Amino acid sequence: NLFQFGDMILQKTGKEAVHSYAIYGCYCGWGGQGRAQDATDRCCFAQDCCYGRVNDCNPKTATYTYSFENGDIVCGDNDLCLRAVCECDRAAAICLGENVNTYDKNYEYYSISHCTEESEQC
Amino acid sequence: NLFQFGDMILQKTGKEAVHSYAIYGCYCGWGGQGRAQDATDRCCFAQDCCYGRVNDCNPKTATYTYSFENGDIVCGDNDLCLRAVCECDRAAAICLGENVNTYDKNYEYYSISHCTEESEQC
């Protein structure tokens, strides 16, 4: 679920997701169309593609099992859907940590008016 | 996609989603666990259950066809998945409009610490 993903993001970026990623660019958090504004937004777009490939559960609300082993994120589910969602979140959180250096506050609160361009493809 | 849902929300509530719903309670926008804080949050929880029933597309990025006929929201897709996502958004936007009167700014920016309680069931 997104709060768990938010826990992963906190560990990898030091940022609270509800004040940042939840409203960043055209794809992070609330969005879904337009062009990914930068590397951070591209992580979110790739994660949405990833969610598109899990199977029968709702990624937003699927509550999975995970742990930090040292700093590494380890998904613990056996259940295929919970596990697949956890793997998408893990990968996306590492991607966000990798690109936190170029995080631009100017992309915060983007809305439909900034995200008109044709959507990205998976 | 969420920006289109945001367009529906704007028409029904007069509020810009990225500044409000996108970070409201335990279920609206960024969330997915805990207890729905109020009627508004319950709309979002029911919408997540609705998304759980559409079929093979990613609701966040599925770009559907809709129009306002007077004030009514009319989904125009033939495609089953796009249509089902549009119907979930339409229903959720009407629900949010119906409950805008009890919208509480105090539920804005809720995070995992406020949404610990056991999750709601569909």
From Swiss-Prot, chains A, B:
Signal peptide (UniProt feature, chain positions): none
A family per Pfam: Phospholip_A2_1
PROSITE patterns reported for this sequence: PA2_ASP (PS00119)
Any one biological process term the GO annotation gives: arachidonate secretion
Compartment(s) of residence: Secreted
Chief subcellular location: secreted
Domain of life, per lineage: Eukaryota
SUPFAM superfamilies, per database record: Phospholipase A2, PLA2
Role this protein plays: Heterodimer: postsynaptic neurotoxin. Monomer: Acidic phospholipase A2 homolog that is non-toxic.
Self-association state and partner proteins as the record states: Heterodimer of A and B (AC P14420) chains; non-covalently linked. The A chain (acidic) is non-toxic, and increases the toxicity of the B chain (basic). The A chain may act as factor stabilizing the complex structure and hence retaining its toxicity by preventing non-specific binding. Upon binding to the target membranes the A chain may dissociate.
PANTHER family in the cross-refs: PHOSPHOLIPASE A2 FAMILY MEMBER (PTHR11716), PHOSPHOLIPASE A2, MEMBRANE ASSOCIATED (PTHR11716:SF9)
This protein's name: Acidic phospholipase A2 homolog vipoxin A chain
Organism of this sequence: Vipera ammodytes meridionalis (Eastern sand viper)
